[PDB]
């Protein structure tokens, strides 16, 4: 169906962008709003309300650019805003080698049902935060499975 084709296209755009950033070890933080509304956090960023594309996602997160600091928040199959604030988790059970991007992802996952993808700038490793837990060192296939499950 049209809705199904659009969801699969968005998943492919995300995974292609994550692949490019993982390979180059470009830090990234991408939160996908689900049932819990995230308007208060969207409002902290730069409004985009843009069509999703792998190219736009990559261009957003290039280091030392205006938009790369903070989270991209996606809502209703669009990029709602970039450079958004997310709350930092105080969970003592996050790997100590991880920094602010990962704590921000876990933090938003503690108070919403959202799914957040993180690319580490140190290693290029890909992780997902959901329900207050961080799922680390994902393969491409694991990330796709999580996006399809969500």
Contact of 67 with 83, CB cutoff 8 Å: yes
Q: Using CB under 6 A as the criterion, what x/- string covers residues 128-147 for binding ligand VOF?
A: ----------xxx--x----
**In the set 113, 137, 140, 145, which binds Mg ion (CB under 5 A)?**
137
- Considering only residues 71 to 100 of the shown chain, the ones binding Mg ion according to CB under 5 A are none
What element of type H or E holds 118? strand 115-119
Using left for φ > 0, alpha for ψ between -120 and 50, and beta otherwise, residue 77 falls in left
The reply to whether 57 sits near ligand VOF by the rule CB under 6 A is no
Could you say which of ligand VOF, a second copy, Mg ion, none residue 13 binds, taking C-beta under 5 to 8 angstroms by partner kind?
none
User: In the stretch 99-128, what mask flags binding to ligand VOF with x, by CB under 6 A?
Assistant: -------------------------x-x--
What is the 3 state secondary structure string of 30-99? EEECCCCCCHHHHCCCEEEEEECCHHHHHHHCCCCCCCCCCEEEEECCEEEEEEECCCCCCCCCCCCCCC
Minimum Å gap between C-beta 137 and Mg ion is 5
Q: Which residues bind a second copy (CB under 8 A)?
A: 46-51, 53-56, 58-60, 62, 65-68, 79, 82-83
């Amino acid at each position: 169906t049209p809705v199904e084709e659009a969801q699969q296209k968005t998943i492919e755009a995300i995974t292609k962008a994550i692949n490019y950033m993982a390979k180059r070890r470009i830090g990234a933080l991408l939160t996908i709003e689900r049932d819990t509304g995230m308007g208060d956090y969207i409002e902290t960023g730069i409004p985009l309300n843009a069509k999703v594309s792998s190219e736009l996602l990559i261009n957003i997160f290039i280091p030392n650019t205006p938009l790369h600091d903070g989270a991209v928040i996606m809502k209703n199959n669009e990029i709602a805003a970039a450079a958004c604030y997310l709350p930092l988790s105080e969970s003592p059970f996050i790997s100590k080698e991880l920094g602010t991007r990962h704590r921000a992802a876990v933090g938003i996952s503690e108070v919403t049902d959202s799914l957040t993808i993180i690319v580490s700038e140190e290693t290029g490793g890909v992780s997902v935060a959901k329900n207050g837990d961080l799922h680390r060192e994902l393969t491409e296939e694991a990330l796709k499975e999580m996006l399809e499950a969500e």
